[PDB]
Design a protein around this nucleic acid. Structure first.
Ligand SMILES: [Mg+2]
Ligand SMILES: [Mg+2]
Ligand SMILES: [Mg+2]
Ligand SMILES: [Mg+2]
Ligand SMILES: [Mg+2]
Ligand SMILES: [Mg+2]
Ligand SMILES: [Mg+2]
Ligand SMILES: [Mg+2]
Ligand SMILES: [Mg+2]
Ligand SMILES: [Mg+2]
Ligand SMILES: [Mg+2]
Ligand SMILES: [Mg+2]
Ligand SMILES: [Mg+2]
Ligand SMILES: [Mg+2]
Ligand SMILES: [Mg+2]
Ligand SMILES: [Mg+2]
Ligand SMILES: [Mg+2]
Ligand SMILES: [Mg+2]
Ligand SMILES: [Mg+2]
Ligand SMILES: [Mg+2]
Ligand SMILES: [Mg+2]
Ligand SMILES: [Mg+2]
Ligand SMILES: [Mg+2]
Ligand SMILES: [Mg+2]
Ligand SMILES: [Mg+2]
Ligand SMILES: [Mg+2]
Ligand SMILES: [Mg+2]
Ligand SMILES: [Mg+2]
Ligand SMILES: [Mg+2]
Ligand SMILES: [Mg+2]
Ligand SMILES: [Mg+2]
Ligand SMILES: [Mg+2]
Ligand SMILES: [Mg+2]
Ligand SMILES: [Mg+2]
Ligand SMILES: [Mg+2]
Ligand SMILES: [Mg+2]
Ligand SMILES: [Mg+2]
Ligand SMILES: [Mg+2]
Ligand SMILES: [Mg+2]
Ligand SMILES: [Mg+2]
Ligand SMILES: [Mg+2]
Ligand SMILES: [Mg+2]
Ligand SMILES: [Mg+2]
Ligand SMILES: [Mg+2]
Ligand SMILES: [Mg+2]
Ligand SMILES: [Mg+2]
Ligand SMILES: [Mg+2]
Ligand SMILES: [Mg+2]
Ligand SMILES: [Mg+2]
Ligand SMILES: [Mg+2]
Ligand SMILES: [Mg+2]
Ligand SMILES: [Mg+2]
Ligand SMILES: [Mg+2]
Lengths: 197, 106, 172, 49, 127
RNA sequence: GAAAUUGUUGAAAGGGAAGGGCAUUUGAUCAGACA
RNA sequence: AGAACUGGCGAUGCGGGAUGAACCGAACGUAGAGUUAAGGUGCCGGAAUACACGCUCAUCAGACACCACAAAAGGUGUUAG
RNA sequence: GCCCUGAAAAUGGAUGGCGCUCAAGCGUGUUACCUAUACUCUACCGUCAGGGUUGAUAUGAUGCCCUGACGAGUAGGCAGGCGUGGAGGUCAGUGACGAAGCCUAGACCGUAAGGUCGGGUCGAACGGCCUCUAGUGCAGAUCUUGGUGGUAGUAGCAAAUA
RNA sequence: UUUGCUCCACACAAUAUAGAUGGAUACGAAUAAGGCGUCCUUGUGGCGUCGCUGAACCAUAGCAGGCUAGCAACGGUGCACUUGGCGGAAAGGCCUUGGGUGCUUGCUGGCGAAUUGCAAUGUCAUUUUGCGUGGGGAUAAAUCAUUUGUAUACGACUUAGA
């Protein structure tokens, strides 16, 4: 559909986000995921915290290096979720993952690019209301991620600039709408209404 | 104009396959904007070019094409089966593909 | 077991020399087809009389159609059921628009609340609760209150594309 | 089977790997927490033993 | 200019090499049937090499035909070559490998006159 | 004057063996048939 | 460890049960098209993030025969009787 | 009923993995969809079977033509074939204008054993067909003899004063 | 060591390509609530309106888009220049000024197109490198050996030498 699809992580469920992101790749669709710290996981924080520590104990007994590596950043928690959904040891596998990029927050390029959402993974469309759920940022920082506060800082800054952008935009579209309204009633206008426009 | 496309965009997905055995003789094709087996019945028999490039010029071009036709629909979500003159290279799982509008029936 | 029809099944004790014209007994039977329905008939008849299909004959099989298929009715349902550790008698009330509908969701309910597969259930009576205030079970009384109105909070629309450009809204 | 008698291990694993350092000039991995009320000054120095 | 024939369909053009001939020098590629008790090949486990069997046998209509249409016939001298005089659309002469050069030229020479096809008309040709 | 095994030259491939099966891309190489 | 009847494995690949002598499906000449079995259809992975009614929230939830275990006894958690 | 307590073991770890909570969980219903060497239809090979056809004046009567069914396989039986050394017959066979042998991700025939050819190398003999004959076919036997590797420029070449 | 390097320009050539073929089209936050317009007492404020999918929006006609003329508008847009300003999370991009210049399918005209033969991707992208030319710019170091001992099995480390 588009050369690159940027997904806003916020309010999405890890494994459902992972499940669709994987399939997109394998089908040739480049993807970037953003705001991965604002990802969700079903189940209360304490559960997904313990679940994390189970992952946390698996290591190669003779050499903790060669054994399973534990990444603590929300992007990378997410990448784990994904890579497991991709035959990542085949060439075709490596191929699809290279089409993928995950980020905390929304760094340059992508922050002036539009981001989409993935309804079949949107927490607010999916979790029965009332069920407890978890935010990645909160989980990650509880397992050692260093950069929650900075990401918060930078975003809040980003988040200021973009409200400027928007408000400025909202004001111009008002002009445009005004402009459109004189054109209303004109011949060409009534004609286009006939043709569904 | 700026658009010249007389085909529909398509994606080379898998070969026909089980869990553990594939069939290089049938390719599976994802056609843009076809969501249902009914939608896909329109495309049955349309012809499909996979176009690709190469180093050696040949009949004067560095562009080559594998050709084939769509043949039946596949499962419930608009995907399509298709066979080619020579089977498709399998590195192409994920590559684009062109589906044409002939042989037409409108 | 499926999507039910309801049948009158009539049968009788193969005639004899000394006893021609045997007594004739009927059952209503809830079943998906007339094949299952005759089976079921013989299943219960050998639980009540001395017959078995071998020595008996089906006389008539007819589908009973719902009297007023678009009138909301309050059904009380009596059932017999087998649990893991012993067998049990029950009463539920189900509100729907046909007895056939009703038996569809009984069977569902037994299966889901008591884990009772279709083999382990016996419908005892299904009968329309005529006058309200004989309606016993509160999960039905609930729906009988005057000028009833209720909203459906937190709307989920089903997406058709994988991607969306909006952020949804569960307003309604 | 099991040690038979218990004794602590031998040496501290927080000092692995026990390899030669990347440089003769060991690195400051940490500076004091900044109290920006005080006057500007250095927070370390260089010398020779 | 060979007799007409149906499309010549080969059925399995890949050589049937011996199992493990690719594994130890001491094992020639020549076919050879495993008789092992445990053997995967003999047991036909998915994954391994197929073995020759009579399913593959070629169409009675095109067997022995080589690409052109002609069955080939080994030829040593002119007498031999002449045995194909009423058979030009059916047989091609192959000149035997130990025929001399000065004799190959007589044989081509005649096969020309007789309109008989020769399959290796370049052997020893003193160019 | 074979083979194991070696030197050199040329071509190619190689993220914890290699080799194998079905299939096709790409390179190299080649038969037949046209008339 | 030892008998009865049948069906198997041994002597046998193929599809399924991740895996596996014996389970489930199905028994093999070379191939094309079709349809299926057992088993599956979020992603790995071909195939509905299908439809429907309930149930269940576990600070060690649960998740499909053979099979890769759990019991008595308890709960003012919740559900229907 | 589901869930929870009852519920303790040794490298880190397994509903197959990821992960899933109005499920991607449990019970039950309804459809659709995926795909086995199996089922249906077709071609081709072979096996078994049943028919037909000695009429000359051309080429296989163990042949030719029609038709139908069938095809797993260890130990094992039988059959039809492939290849070697030597023997009788024959082709008045090949050959110093190059026999035999050897090399060749060159060609062709055979389902296969194998056969055939080109090119290179070479130097004196050799082959097709019908038959006869056997000291007649190797991957194994801690097989026999001979030759050769990785190990590896490695262990080492440090006793007896210099 | 035979005129080498670099940034820009075009030129020839090679070599590629996980897969151009109108546009990745920018608040935030909530979802048992929100967007937008408008008013005002500027608020957890009044009033109005919208959703129920991007099925949108934008673009889109012209030899793959030729050669030309005119009108109406004074708008749109490409391009190289110039004015001011912003962006460090990976800013490496965004906005503003001003003249120049091309196009305009906003409307109305003149001319061209065939024979590529009834389809054959019918070749219009961007990767990296190599070689000359001439428009700017730039004129090192590391290693061996020697040497120290803050080091060392050998490499390595650390000093020193116009
Ligand atoms: Mg009635
Ligand atoms: Mg101890
Ligand atoms: Mg170092
Ligand atoms: Mg053998
Ligand atoms: Mg063995
Ligand atoms: Mg065995
Ligand atoms: Mg010599
Ligand atoms: Mg191949
Ligand atoms: Mg045995
Ligand atoms: Mg078997
Ligand atoms: Mg299997
Ligand atoms: Mg299992
Ligand atoms: Mg059974
Ligand atoms: Mg996987
Ligand atoms: Mg799939
Ligand atoms: Mg469906
Ligand atoms: Mg059981
Ligand atoms: Mg209990
Ligand atoms: Mg209870
Ligand atoms: Mg479990
Ligand atoms: Mg699973
Ligand atoms: Mg279910
Ligand atoms: Mg078959
Ligand atoms: Mg057999
Ligand atoms: Mg013989
Ligand atoms: Mg002999
Ligand atoms: Mg002898
Ligand atoms: Mg060789
Ligand atoms: Mg040849
Ligand atoms: Mg020669
Ligand atoms: Mg020779
Ligand atoms: Mg001599
Ligand atoms: Mg003989
Ligand atoms: Mg012997
Ligand atoms: Mg052998
Ligand atoms: Mg040997
Ligand atoms: Mg050996
Ligand atoms: Mg042996
Ligand atoms: Mg030996
Ligand atoms: Mg030496
Ligand atoms: Mg030494
Ligand atoms: Mg010594
Ligand atoms: Mg010494
Ligand atoms: Mg000494
Ligand atoms: Mg590539
Ligand atoms: Mg409002
Ligand atoms: Mg407002
Ligand atoms: Mg308001
Ligand atoms: Mg819009
Ligand atoms: Mg134009
Ligand atoms: Mg980036
Ligand atoms: Mg014009
Ligand atoms: Mg220069």
């Amino acid at each position: 559909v588009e050369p690159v699809v940027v997904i806003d992580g916020k309010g999405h469920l890890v494994g459902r986000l992972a499940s669709v992101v994987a399939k997109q790749l394998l089908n040739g669709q480049k993807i970037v995921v953003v705001r991965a710290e604002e990802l969700n996981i079903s189940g209360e924080f304490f559960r997904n915290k313990l679940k994390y520590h189970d992952f946390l104990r698996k290591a190669t007994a003779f050499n903790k290096t060669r054994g399973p590596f534990h990444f603590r950043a929300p992007s990378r928690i997410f990448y784990k979720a994904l890579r497991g959904m991709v035959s990542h040891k085949t060439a075709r596998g490596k191929a699809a993952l290279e089409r993928l990029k995950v980020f905390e927050g929304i760094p340059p390029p992508y922050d002036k690019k539009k981001r989409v959402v993935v309804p079949q993974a949107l927490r607010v469309l999916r979790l029965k209301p009332g069920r407890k759920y978890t935010t990645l940022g909160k989980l990650s920082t509880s397992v050692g991620w260093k950069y929650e506060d900075v990401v918060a800082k930078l975003e809040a800054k980003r988040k200021v600039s973009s409200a400027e952008y928007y408000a400025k935009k909202r004001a111009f579209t008002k002009k445009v709408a005004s402009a459109n309204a004189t054109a209303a009633e004109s011949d060409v206008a009534k004609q286009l209404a006939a043709l569904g426009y | 104009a700026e658009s010249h496309r007389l085909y529909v965009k398509g994606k080379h997905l898998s070969y026909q396959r089980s869990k553990r055995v594939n069939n290089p003789n049938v390719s599976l094709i994802k056609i843009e904007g076809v969501a249902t087996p009914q939608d896909a019945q329109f495309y049955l028999g349309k012809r499909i070019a996979y176009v690709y490039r190469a180093s050696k010029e040949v009949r004067g071009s560095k562009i080559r094409v594998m050709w084939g036709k769509v043949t039946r629909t596949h499962g419930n979500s608009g995907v399509v089966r298709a066979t080619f003159r020579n089977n498709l290279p399998a590195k192409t799982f994920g590559a684009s593909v062109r589906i044409f509008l002939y042989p037409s029936n409108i | 077991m499926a999507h039910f029809k309801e049948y009158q099944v009539i049968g009788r004790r193969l005639p004899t020399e000394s006893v021609p014209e045997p007594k004739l007994f009927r059952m209503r039977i809830f079943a998906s087809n007339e094949v299952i329905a005759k089976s079921r008939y013989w299943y219960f008849l050998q639980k009540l009389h001395k017959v078995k299909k071998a020595s008996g004959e089906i006389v008539s099989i007819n589908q009973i159609n719902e009297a007023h298929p678009t009138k909301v009715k309050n059904f009380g349902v009596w059932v017999r059921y087998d649990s893991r550790s012993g067998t049990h008698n029950m009463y539920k009330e189900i509100r729907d628009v046909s007895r056939v509908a009703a038996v569809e969701t009984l069977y569902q309910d037994m299966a889901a609340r008591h884990r009772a597969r279709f083999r382990s259930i016996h419908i005892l009576k299904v009968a329309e609760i005529e006058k309200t205030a004989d309606v016993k079970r509160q999960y039905v009384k609930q729906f009988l209150t005057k000028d009833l109105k209720f909203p459906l909070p937190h709307r989920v629309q089903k997406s058709t594309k994988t991607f969306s450009y909006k952020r949804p809204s569960t307003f309604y | 089977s099991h040690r038979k008698y218990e004794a602590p291990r031998h040496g501290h694993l927080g000092f692995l790997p026990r390899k030669r350092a990347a440089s003769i000039r060991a690195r400051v991995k940490a500076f004091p927490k900044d109290d920006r009320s005080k006057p500007v000054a250095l927070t370390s120095f260089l010398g020779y033993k | 200019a060979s007799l007409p024939h149906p499309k010549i369909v080969k059925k399995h053009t890949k050589k049937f090499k011996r199992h493990h001939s690719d594994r130890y020098h001491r094992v020639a590629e020549n076919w050879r049937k495993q008789k092992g008790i445990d053997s995967v090949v003999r047991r036909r486990f998915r994954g391994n090499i197929s073995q020759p069997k009579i399913g593959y046998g070629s169409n009675k209509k095109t067997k022995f035909l080589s690409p052109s249409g002609h069955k080939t016939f080994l030829v040593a001298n002119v007498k031999d070559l002449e045995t194909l005089t009423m058979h030009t659309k059916t047989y091609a002469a192959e000149i035997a490998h130990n025929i001399s050069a000065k004799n190959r030229v007589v044989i081509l020479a005649r096969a020309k006159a007789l309109g008989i096809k020769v399959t290796n008309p370049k052997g020893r040709l003193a160019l």
